[PDB]
Design a protein around this ligand. Sequence first.
Ligand SMILES: COc1nc(N)nc2c1C(=O)N([C@H]1CCCCC1(F)F)C2
Ligand SMILES: COc1nc(N)nc2c1C(=O)N([C@H]1CCCCC1(F)F)C2
Ligand SMILES: N[C@@H](CCCC[NH3+])C(=O)O
Ligand SMILES: N[C@@H](CCCC[NH3+])C(=O)O
Lengths: 468, 468
Amino acid sequence: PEQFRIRRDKRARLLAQGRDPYPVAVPRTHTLAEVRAAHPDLPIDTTEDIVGVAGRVIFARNSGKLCFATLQDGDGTQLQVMIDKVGQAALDAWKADVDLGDIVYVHGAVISSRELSVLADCWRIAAKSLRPLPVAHKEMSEESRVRQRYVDLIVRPEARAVARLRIAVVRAIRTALQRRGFLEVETPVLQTLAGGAAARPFATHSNALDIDLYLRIAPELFLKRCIVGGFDKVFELNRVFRNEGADSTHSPEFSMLETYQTYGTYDDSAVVTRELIQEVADEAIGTRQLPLPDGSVYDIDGEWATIQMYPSLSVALGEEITPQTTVDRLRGIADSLGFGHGKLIEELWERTVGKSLSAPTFVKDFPVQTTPLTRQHRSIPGVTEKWDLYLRGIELATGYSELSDPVVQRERFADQARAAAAGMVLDEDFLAALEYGMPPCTGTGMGIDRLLMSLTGLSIRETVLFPI
Amino acid sequence: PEQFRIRRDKRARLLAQGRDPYPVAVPRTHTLAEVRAAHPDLPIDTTEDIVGVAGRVIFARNSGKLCFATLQDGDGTQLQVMIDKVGQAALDAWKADVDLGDIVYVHGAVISSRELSVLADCWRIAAKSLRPLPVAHKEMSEESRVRQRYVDLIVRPEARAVARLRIAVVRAIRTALQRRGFLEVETPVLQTLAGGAAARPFATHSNALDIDLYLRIAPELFLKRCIVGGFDKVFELNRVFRNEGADSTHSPEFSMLETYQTYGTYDDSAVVTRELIQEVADEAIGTRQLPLPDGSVYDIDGEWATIQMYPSLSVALGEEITPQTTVDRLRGIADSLGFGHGKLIEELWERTVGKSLSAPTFVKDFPVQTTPLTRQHRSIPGVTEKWDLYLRGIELATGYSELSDPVVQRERFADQARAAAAGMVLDEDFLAALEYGMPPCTGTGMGIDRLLMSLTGLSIRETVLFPI
Ligand SMILES: COc1nc(N)nc2c1C(=O)N([C@H]1CCCCC1(F)F)C2
Ligand SMILES: COc1nc(N)nc2c1C(=O)N([C@H]1CCCCC1(F)F)C2
Ligand SMILES: N[C@@H](CCCC[NH3+])C(=O)O
Ligand SMILES: N[C@@H](CCCC[NH3+])C(=O)O
């Protein structure tokens, strides 16, 4: 706590002496990992490979004529340094000047101790830390790890690995989609009215236009415009904003993938989603027998079951539930266990069938009420061609066979608007685009955080770099 | 105008007959481009390659026993269809049912007319357009093209090419950075206070937290946190939000690239920026002798000149200007042509040297006042290690040797805050991170819209898909 001051004082006296504790440049020749992969099996306690390395001093051990430190590169990789070879003054400076958490450059020969080490010709402070690292045991509380992610990444290896995983996962996704001929597009974040999902928006006032603008809840309506526009295959991986509460599967800002493919249906996009998720596991995790903090293994290999909502619900409840089942009947059943038809079906389905699922599973054929954007089913009356994908109990992803009928689409919105009216403007430009004609296409959505969670067992608070 | 109604009426009667004008599926076997690349040089007026194609009817020409139409796939590619082979009823339906702007599937043999055509076994409406296309000559006004981008992309080839260019450019960028070992990260859009640039923020109220949040003006402060965190090389390509006016180089929402590289300086990031831009041209445009709507050619090949701000200004003004030149002196000069020292230097420099530049040029060594985040110059007093890159007269990109000194950084912000005080909270967490120690690193910024503009001659209103 007081050591904040002595650190500040070492900076000040280093400046005064004409030593630079935040130099513009130091000539680092190699990352530590490069040095390692260069000398994998050096006869220990024995080379003229001179290098210039840098790193954070995370461990010091001083001893009269010779000091040893651990340099940890930013990615975790470790090289020990040993400060006769040059400078008594140098050794004194080392001792008086270098603290833990300081970034340090050293130039010299690579050797192995009686542990891979560089024995120094030169050395220099690259950066002076005016704050010690927490010992970290002292296990940084969950909400101090998130509020100081920079320290977390320094002190806790797993923080490093997770960060790098998300990054790998996201790249895996872009690779996979690009391989299949999808083009990534940028669609507006600031919108005059935010559609493509159910949620309350974030509103912000524009100075330029003296009007409110609304942060997107989803790119769907614009992505659809792109399909009208002649895009065959488009995706957009980026943030959406839902002005609502936070829980273990929900946060107001999060990164979601959306995907749109002309001349396929929800049956086609189901297959791609599977392949996509499996292909991600392979690239980023390396197995489809997923290890969990549980200590368990979750198998996502092979084919995944598809069930239908109404039938699977029927089996769970012991009676035939259809689009014709009244709200009065559903209410009764709901009660006997512990607004509208659609909402009741989904709710009962989750409370019965959904919760019981283990293996990866698509549920498909959804109530029309609760699916305003998705086409009516090709044969079955009363339902829409939508699936949800449940993986390891997490609601991962949806796909639709997309409603391209403007008149029907107009109605779906008129119903929506009239439901939440307090006395009714629709998204006229969207509908305008539909009436220019949108070819048959299937869209998907997927949450990145959900993806990682489902894959790893990590909480939403660990998957993102800087939450709050 | 009235044709809106007859189109709506054809939908309605098609529904009634049990013809589906928005079918879930049609079994398209090939894109038109696939058909083309399959039959590049077919002896005209002469094959048993049956296909299933789809496309928008953009040209109709009817003739008793035989109708011809142009199917244009979404990307522009064209195949003609010819509707004896099946159905008198079929030909009647064609004539009464199909209008221009309708999406249509046809299945049959590929042939060449007396023009590559498919002569139909089957055909079906995939989508019914309840709105005709504008003839487009009738040249869609600039602000009707942007407000209805979906129609633009249908009707105007160049709209198609530009859309696809931006997309190629953005991928080119990610390829280039990834090749060099940069990791792309996601940093928050919603912030408790927005830093990393000069601009007024967008503010939005949170329901979860009953507080205002501020849309990011720039990712820099968080990207820096990542470097502290041990990232060696990180970039973030994504939207930033500056609550300010729109002009020909400025819009409140736009996509920018930021880049951060440990153990290099502004001299190093200058080189990468060049290589990066040149590598983009190569991938996306195919030449570095850039064609312009001007009718001119702009050469971005080869090495680019670096000049210094103070000296180049001095030469332009005919007197020695230094960090020591007073605001009283600068004011005088400014006057004689037609707030603080820094602002005056930059202003004079632009009004004299900047405007005169043609070839690609870095200007470097900037006034300390106007560069709070960038390190002080290694030798030259009074200036910071920042460059700006001017390409074809457009302000494309900046790079810094990054200020990692927390105490200095604290001062820079205290000066800033006190300047715009009306009677002073700083970004304490940012500074906290700096005092954990950030290794020497060089950041860059670059505007995607600027990039495209500089490369192509296109206005900012054409480079983005959906502005306003
Ligand atoms: C943290 O992730 C989320 N946060 C909020 N607040 N809302 C959602 C998610 C999430 O993953 N969602 C999924 C649902 C299934 C389709 C894709 C999706 F991303 F939308 C909806
Ligand atoms: C349309 O682009 C922009 N709109 C606004 N409103 N502000 C800026 C740009 C843009 O490209 N900028 C550049 C300046 C040079 C460094 C990179 C940058 F992206 F910030 C600053
Ligand atoms: N917009 C959906 C995802 C895309 C569904 C298919 N059109 C959501 O917010 O969940
Ligand atoms: N944040 C800068 C770009 C990065 C400069 C280097 N740290 C801007 O808004 O222009």
